[PDB]
Structure 1
């Protein structure tokens, strides 16, 4: 099954939910969620995963925080903004 970070990178590459997520500095791998439209993207993640409950942005961000130690995605000190690792972007 797809991993969360790859789901997000795939969306940014396809442009399919441009009102929910976007690059801030694509060369650096920084991206940002929409305050008003992030829940539709969270819903899509949960449905893709076949999870029992409806996915929320809060639960999705709880999973995102677990990448901080291994490095795939780190939180940036800007509202709703994160950064992929060079390894993730190169692969």
Structure 2
């Protein structure tokens, strides 16, 4: 099963949901969600996973917070903005 950080990186590479997520500085790996269109992206994550309940941005962000310690994705001090690690970006 695909991991959440990989799902997001794949979307950014494909450009399939450009109204919901975008790079801020791709060289640094920083990216940002749309305030008004993030829920559609969260719904897609839950359906891809086959989860029992509808996925929400809140639940997806709760999962994202767990990456802070291990480092794959860290929150940036800008609205709805996060940063992938160099390791995630290189693989």
Partner secondary structure for residue 59 of structure 2: helix
Partner secondary structure for residue 69 of structure 1: helix
CA positional deviation for 1:63: 0.1
Report the RMSD for the aligned CA atoms in angstroms.
0.2
Partner secondary structure for residue 69 of structure 2: coil
Alpha-carbon displacement from aligned partner over 1:18-62 (angstroms, at most 9, x marks no partner): 000000000000000000000000000000000000000000000
Partner secondary structure for residue 60 of structure 2: helix
Gaps spanning 5+ residues in structure 2: where? none
Gaps spanning 5+ residues in structure 1: where? none
Aligned length in residues: 91
